């Protein structure tokens, strides 16, 4: 009976790899990836030759191979699979079929940003992406506006300015927010301020919203 | 001016440390640790000879801030997993941030996330709740405050309180709420078992081994019910 390995990958820095990750990737019969080409680049950097299987169900196909006794590693493009990344259907399928699922610890952008924010982390909520539509986004924000826990959002560069102005609008312009940009890359920048002043600070320079970002929002006073 | 590095460490398997963590732990002037003896043992496995600083005080945060300002680089670690995630360091990071000191987080092991990735529950959104109160009365109140939460919930629980805690979860959340018990992740006794919580509680009681070691609880969020 085969096993499924969940294997987190770097989020922009290739030294953020672990030895057990490299050993699992090289040992499994098959690697199910989000994008076979991103992962191929990654594998070639570490001198690992492996069979890739694209993850565009397909769960049932991979399930059969596991029952045939094949070991499978699930990876995503960056970070930890199933955290706003594919694989939720496969793990469900495998688990009720009695397939052992083995998670490797590794990089996760949300936790990485939270560890550097200087905000209360005894409790937090992970919200993923805000809605793209301005109305739907203001409604998600009103929905959590009272939440006392630290909130973590993933946000896109094109939508940051609009998201931030809505946040000012709904949560108020003195709500402390930490913007974590391009974690573990050369450009890495983490800056926190009252969200009013943060929005002002971001607009001063266009580059301050370039690349991948996480927002850490302080929770309501309570 | 020096920088403050936030450095995750293994949660039971030495091959889970990142290569960059090893690089940083060997390059900084000082390692500030939750427990210098526990950290000493980890460093020893990797041949690393380092200067350790005990965090056991905004007083000590002021000490470290001073070193950073005179140009010293500092790494912060906890006994396991990611610092600040139910581990000290929060005030130090804050103090450094408001003084212009750059904080550099390294990604790495975190038990909550590791468990979540393999639990088979919705992770589109989730709540990290940490440790439930140790006393049953306190614990039941904390559970009542989140009974209606629709997001997947994550809890840390101790081996000595798991059976009591599971009894209170049955009682407050109901015996059918799906819960996953992730035990001894990355260790040789690793076991991830999910079930309606009343069944989970019974399953655990069959064999005392099933509650030994370190554990995460992944709890299915609340679904709407007519009985209300
Ligand atoms: C679809 S998600 C993948 C999340 C990933 N699986 C993880 O482990 O967090 C991609 C989003 O994560 C966040 N992210 C990923 N890498 C990042 C980095 N290096 N710095 C800041 N945010 C990052 C960004 O918000 C980006 O839009
Ligand atoms: C105070 S916390 C430290 C959390 C750590 N900072 C992290 O990022 O995961 C310790 C608790 O985390 C959970 N934990 C740590 N290691 C674990 C493992 N290998 N398997 C299951 N749970 C673990 C247990 O509930 C343990 O009592």
Author numbering:
A (entry chain B): 11 to 66, 72 to 237
B (entry chain A): 11 to 66, 70 to 241
Question: Can I see the authors' text?
Answer:
RsmI and RsmH were recently identified S-Adenosylmethionine (AdoMet)-dependent MTases responsible for the 2′-O-methylation and N4-methylation of C1402 (m4Cm1402) in bacterial 16S rRNA, respectively. The position C1402 can make direct contacts with the phosphate backbone of the P-site codon, and the modification by RsmI and RsmH plays an important role in P-site function, especially in start codon selection. RsmI is the only 2′-O-MTase among known MTases modifying bacterial 16S rRNA, and its catalytic mechanism remains unclear. The structure of RsmI monomer is composed of two independent domains: the N-terminal domain (NTD) and the C-terminal domain (CTD).
Our previous study showed the full-length RsmI was not amenable to crystallization, and the truncation Gly12-Pro258 was expressed, purified and co-crystallized with the AdoMet substrate in this study. The complex structure was solved by molecular replacement in space group C2 at a 2.20 Å resolution, and the details of data collection and structure refinement are given in Table 1. The asymmetric unit contains three RsmI molecules; two of them form a dimer formed by a noncrystallographic two-fold axis, while the third one also participates in a dimer, formed by the crystallographic two-fold axis. The crystal structure of RsmI further reveals a compact homodimer by making extensive contacts between two subunits. The two subunits interact with each other by a “back to back” mode and are nearly perpendicular with each other, and in this case the AdoMet is exposed to solvent for catalysis. AdoMet is bound into the cleft between NTD and CTD in the present complex, and the electron density for the whole AdoMet molecule was clear, therefore with well-defined conformation and orientation. AdoMet is bound tightly in a canonical conformation in the pocket which mainly consists of three loops: β1-α1 and β4-α4 from NTD domain, and β8-β9 from CTD domain, as well as sheet β7, forming a deep groove with dominantly negative charges. The direct contacts (within 3.8 Å) with AdoMet are mediated by Ile21, Thr95, Ile98 and Asp100 from NTD, and Ala124, Tyr169, Glu170, Leu198 and Met228 from CTD, with twelve H-bonds that stabilize the position and orientation of AdoMet. According to our crystal structure, we predicted the mutant D100K would abolish its side chain-mediating H-bond with AdoMet and significantly alter the surface change of AdoMet-binding pocket (from negative to positive). It was confirmed by the ITC result of D100K mutation with a complete loss of binding affinity.
